[PDB]
Amino acid sequence: PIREQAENIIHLFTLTNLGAPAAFKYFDTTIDRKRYTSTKEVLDATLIHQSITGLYETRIDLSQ
DNA sequence: ATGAGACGCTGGCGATTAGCTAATCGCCAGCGTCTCATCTTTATGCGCC
């Protein structure tokens, strides 16, 4: 039914939530958390030194 | 002429689970012949505008 599928579509949003990844379920399908076990890709990413309203963005290209 | 709005351990381990070039050196390399002819070219030796 449509209602249950809506509730479980709602359940799926925690995967797209901001922040730490935590587990959840869709019906009986336990959907675990996707942890990022390697931090090598950050080393050549873009450092974002930040400000309280997110209006004043200062960006640093981590290539030095 | 009342009954909604306020939703979790995760990070830091082990310990699986999975998977990959690279640096060093050594080995070891298809080869055998003949015939036949064919042309060149070189060393030396001989001549004045």
Per 3-state DSSP, chain A is made up of helix, strand and coil in percentages (nearest 5) of 30, 20, 50
**A61: closest CA among A52, A49, A53, A14?**
A49
CA of A19: nearest nucleotide by C1' is B10
Distance A36 CA to B18 C1' (A): 17
Classify strands A46-50 and A57-61 as parallel, antiparallel or unpaired. Answer: antiparallel
Count of CB atoms situated within 10 Å of the CB of A14 = 14
